[PDB]
C-alpha cells in the first residue's frame, strides 16, 4: 500500500541500497538522493535506466576517468550495474511491501 | 547437545563467476534435517533447493554470481530435539568482477630459506580491499586479506613468513570494494618465489658475449658439475624468473641455455643463474653475476689505439689507449673471444679529450687478438657507446 511509512521506508532503503553498490558513492556523490523520490515508487524499475544514463554521462568527466564504475570493471563480462539496481529495487520493494 | 555440523564447499570457497559450486553440510550419521543461511542478507537461492537434496546436506549452485557471494553457516534441528549449534563460517567468494591487480615481491622473488619477503599488490583504480592467496597443486587456496596497512587505496603489502623449501610457493592477489567484500576482482598473474639453499653454484655464460648491440640475439647458458637437471635464470629488477630446459647430467655435467632476441636497452642488466636436482625444490647458491651491456646507446663514438704499435714481439711494454671527445665516466676494454669480464677504468681528461690507459705490461701470445673499447656513463649503467674500430695485436 502507498502510505507514509512505506513511501519513506522505500526511499531511504533504496538510497541506502544504491550507496551500497560498489562505485556509486564515489561517482555520484551526494546527488544520489536526488534519483530516489515518491515518483520512483510508482515506476521503480525506472531507476535502472536513470542511474545508468547518469553514470555513462559522469564517466565522460575528466576527473572520473580513474573511478571504479568507469574503468575498473572487467570488460569481458556483462555489466553488473543494471542487475544490481534491479535487485536493489526489488529487494527493497519486498521488504517494504511485506508490511505484515 | 548434538555435535555441531561441518560446512565446506566443493570445489572450493573462492570460485570464478559462472563456475559451479556445492555447499555441503554434514552432522552425525543421521539426516532428514538440514539448514543453510547467509549472514546479514538472506540468500533466496537456498529456498529453491529440492527437499531431497537438503536432506543429503547438499546446496548446489550451477552458476555462481555475486548474488551467491557471502558468509554461510549451517545447522540441523530435529523434531523432539531443538537443533544443533551453527557450523563454523564458510566465506563463499565470487571472483572476476574487476580488472586484475599486479603482484610483485619486494625486493626480489628470490628468497633465502628461512627468510621473509614483502608481496605487493597494486591496482590501477583505487580499492579499499585486497586479499593475497597462497596456491598449491595438492592444496586448496589459503587467502589472507588486508584493509588495515592497505596504503594509498591503490596498493597493499603483505609480509610472507618463513619460506621453506618444503613446498612450491604460488601466489595470486585480488582487489575488492568493501561494499561487496565477497565479490573479488580477476586474479593477478601467479607469482612463484625461488627459495634458496647453499648447494654448489652453477656458472653463467653468454654467447656471443656480454656486450651485445640492439637487434642482435644472445644465448644465456647455465652449467654445473654438481649434477643439476633444472636451471633458473633471474635478472635484477624483474617480476619473474626464467626456468630454462635442463639437459640430462653426464659426469655431473649439465648445461641449459636460453636464446633471446631482438636485443633492446631492456636486456641490459645483472643476471644470476641457479641449479637444482629433480627431487630438491631448494635451489643452489647463485652463479657469480653477469652484466649484459647494450652497445651503441650514446651519440659519442670511441677510438682505440696502441702506443708502440699494432705489431710487437714478446715481452715488450704495451699499453692500449681508449678515448672519446665527449664526456664519459668510464672506458671498457674487450678482446675477441675472452671469457673474462671486460676491463673497466675510470676516465681521465688529457689532450682535450677523455681517455683511459689499459697497460698490458710484457706481451705473451695470449696478449694478442682483437680489441675493442667502449664508453660508459653511470647515469645509464648497463648501456655503452658503439665499439671502437677493432684493433689487432700480433705478437712474435
Ligand atoms: C711500460 O713501462 C713502465 C714499466 O716498466 C710503465 O710506466 C709507468 O706507468 C704508470 C701507469 O700508471 C705511470 O703512472 C708511471 O709514471 C710510469 N712509469 C714511469 C717511471 O713514469 C708502464 O707499464 C708502461 N709505460 C707506458 C708509457 O705505457
Ligand atoms: C645450447 O644447448 C644445447 C644442448 O642442450 C646445444 O645445442 C648447445 O650446447 C647450445 N647451443 C649453442 C648454440 O651453443
Ligand atoms: C624428473 O623426473 C622424470 C620422471 O618423472 C624424469 O623423466 C626426469 O629425470 C626428470 N624430468 C624433468 C622434467 O626434470
Contact assessment for residue B330 and residue B347, using Cβ atoms and an 8 Å cutoff = yes
Please write down the HEC assignment for all residues of B200-221: CCCEEEEECCCEECCCCCEEEE
Q: Where are the alpha helices (DSSP H) in B179-269?
A: none
Distance of alpha carbon B271 from alpha carbon B279, whole angstroms: 25
Query: Could B179 and A74 be called an inter-chain contact, meaning their C-beta atoms sit closer than 8 Å?
Result: no
Nearest to A68 among B66, B125, B183 (CB): B125
The residue whose CA is least distant from atom 2 of ligand 3 is B278
Backbone angles phi, psi at B207, to 5 degrees: -115, 130
The answer to whether the beta carbons of residues B300 and B375 sit under 8 Å apart is: yes
Burial B123-150 (b: 16+ CB within 10 A, else e): bebbbebbbbbbbeeeeebebebeeeeb
Distance B230 CA to ligand 3 centre (A): 10
| Contact yes or no for B113/B165 (Cβ under 8 A) | yes
Q: How far is the CA of B257 from the centre of ligand 2 (A)?
A: 7
Kindly state if the Cβ of B280 falls inside 6 Å of ligand 3: no
Angle at A22 between CA A18 and CA A28, to 5 degrees: 60
Resolution (A): 3.0
Cα separation, B150 vs B107, in Å, equals 18
C-alpha B246 to ligand 3 mean position (Å): 10
Query: What is the full DSSP assignment across B10-79?
Result: ES-SEEETT--EEEEEE-SS--S--EEEESSS--GGGTTS-HHHHTTTEEEESS--TTT-EEEEEE---S
d(CA A83, CA B216): 54
Residues of B in contact with A20 (CB under 8 A): 179
Contacts of B123 in chain A (CB under 8 A): 72
Per DSSP, the residues of A23-51 read THHHHHGGGGGGG--HHHHHSTTHHHHHH
CA distance B36 to B57: 9
Nearest residue CA, atom 13 of ligand 2?
B219
Query: For ligand 2, atom 2, which residue shows the shortest CA distance?
Result: B257
User: What's the per-residue H, E or C state across B166-183?
Assistant: CCCCEEEEEEECCCCCCE
Q: Please report, for chain B, the start and end positions of each structural domain, with discontinuous segments joined by +.
A: 6-96, 97-192, 203-294, 302-392
| B90: number of Cβ within 10 Å | 19
The residue to which cell 557471494 is assigned: B69
How far is Cα B132 from Cα B128, in angstroms, rounded to an integer? 14
Which residue in the block uniquely carries the three cell numbers 520493494?
A93
For residues B87 and B25, the answer to whether their CB atoms sit within 8 Å is: yes
d(CA B159, CA B153): 18
Q: Which of B67, B124, B127 sits opposite A87 (nearest CB)?
A: B67
Cβ-based interface (< 8 Å): residues of A facing B: 19-23, 25, 66-68, 71-74, 77, 80, 87
Experimental method: X-ray
Amino acid at each position: 500500500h502507498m502510505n507514509y511509512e512505506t513511501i519513506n521506508a522505500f526511499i531511504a532503503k533504496t538510497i541506502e541500497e544504491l550507496e551500497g553498490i560498489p562505485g556509486i558513492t564515489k561517482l555520484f556523490g551526494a546527488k544520489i538522493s536526488q534519483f530516489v523520490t515518491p515518483a520512483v515508487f510508482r515506476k521503480p524499475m525506472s531507476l535502472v535506466e536513470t542511474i545508468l544514463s547518469e553514470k555513462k554521462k559522469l564517466c565522460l568527466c575528466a576527473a572520473n576517468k580513474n573511478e571504479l564504475l568507469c574503468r575498473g570493471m572487467n570488460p569481458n563480462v556483462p555489466e553488473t550495474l543494471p542487475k544490481k539496481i534491479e535487485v536493489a529495487v526489488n529487494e527493497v520493494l519486498s521488504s517494504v511491501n511485506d508490511t505484515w | 547437545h548434538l555435535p555441531k555440523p561441518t560446512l565446506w564447499a566443493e570445489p572450493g570457497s573462492v570460485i570464478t563467476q559462472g563456475s559451479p559450486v556445492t555447499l555441503r553440510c554434514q552432522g552425525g550419521q543421521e539426516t532428514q534435517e538440514y539448514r543453510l543461511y547467509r549472514e546479514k542478507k538472506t540468500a533466496l537461492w537456498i529456498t529453491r533447493i529440492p527437499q531431497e537434496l537438503v536432506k543429503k546436506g547438499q546446496f548446489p549452485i550451477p552458476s555462481i554470481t555475486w548474488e551467491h557471494a557471502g558468509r554461510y553457516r549451517c545447522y540441523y534441528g530435529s523434531d523432539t530435539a531443538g537443533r544443533s549449534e551453527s557450523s563454523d563460517p564458510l566465506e563463499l567468494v565470487v571472483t572476476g568482477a574487476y580488472i586484475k591487480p599486479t603482484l610483485s615481491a619486494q625486493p626480489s622473488p628470490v628468497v633465502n630459506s628461512g627468510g621473509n619477503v614483502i608481496l605487493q599488490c597494486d591496482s590501477q583504480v583505487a580499492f579499499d580491499g585486497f586479499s593475497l592467496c597462497k596456491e598449491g597443486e595438492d592444496e586448496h587456496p589459503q587467502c589472507l586479506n588486508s584493509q588495515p596497512h592497505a596504503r594509498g587505496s591503490s596498493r597493499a603489502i603483505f609480509s610472507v613468513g618463513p619460506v621453506s623449501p618444503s613446498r612450491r610457493w604460488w601466489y595470486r592477489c585480488y582487489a575488492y570494494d568493501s561494499n561487496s567484500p565477497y565479490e573479488w576482482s580477476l586474479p593477478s598473474d601467479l607469482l612463484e618465489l625461488l627459495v634458496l639453499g647453499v648447494s654448489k653454484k652453477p656458472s653463467l655464460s653468454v654467447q656471443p658475449g656480454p656486450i651485445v648491440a640492439p637487434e642482435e640475439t644472445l644465448t644465456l647458458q647455465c652449467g654445473s658439475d654438481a649434477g643439476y637437471n633444472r636451471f633458473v635464470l633471474y635478472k635484477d629488477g624483474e617480476r619473474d624468473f626464467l626456468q630454462l630446459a635442463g639437459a640430462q647430467p653426464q659426469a655431473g655435467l649439465s648445461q641449459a641455455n636460453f636464446t633471446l632476441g631482438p636485443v633492446s636497452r631492456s636486456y641490459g642488466g645483472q643476471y644470476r643463474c641457479y641449479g637444482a636436482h629433480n627431487l630438491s625444490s631448494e635451489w643452489s647458491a647463485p652463479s657469480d653475476p653477469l652484466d649484459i651491456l647494450i652497445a651503441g646507446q650514446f651519440y659519442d663514438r670511441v677510438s682505440l689505439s696502441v702506443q708502440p704499435g699494432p705489431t710487437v714481439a714478446s715481452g715488450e711494454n704495451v699499453t692500449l689507449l681508449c678515448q672519446s671527445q665527449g664526456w664519459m665516466q668510464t672506458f671498457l676494454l674487450t678482446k675477441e673471444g675472452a671469457a673474462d669480464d671486460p676491463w673497466r677504468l675510470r676516465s681521465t681528461y688529457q689532450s682535450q679529450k677523455y681517455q683511459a690507459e689499459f697497460p698490458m705490461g710484457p706481451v705473451t701470445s695470449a696478449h694478442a687478438g682483437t680489441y675493442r673499447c667502449y664508453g660508459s656513463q653511470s647515469s645509464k649503467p648497463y648501456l655503452l657507446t658503439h665499439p671502437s674500430d677493432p684493433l689487432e695485436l700480433v705478437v712474435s
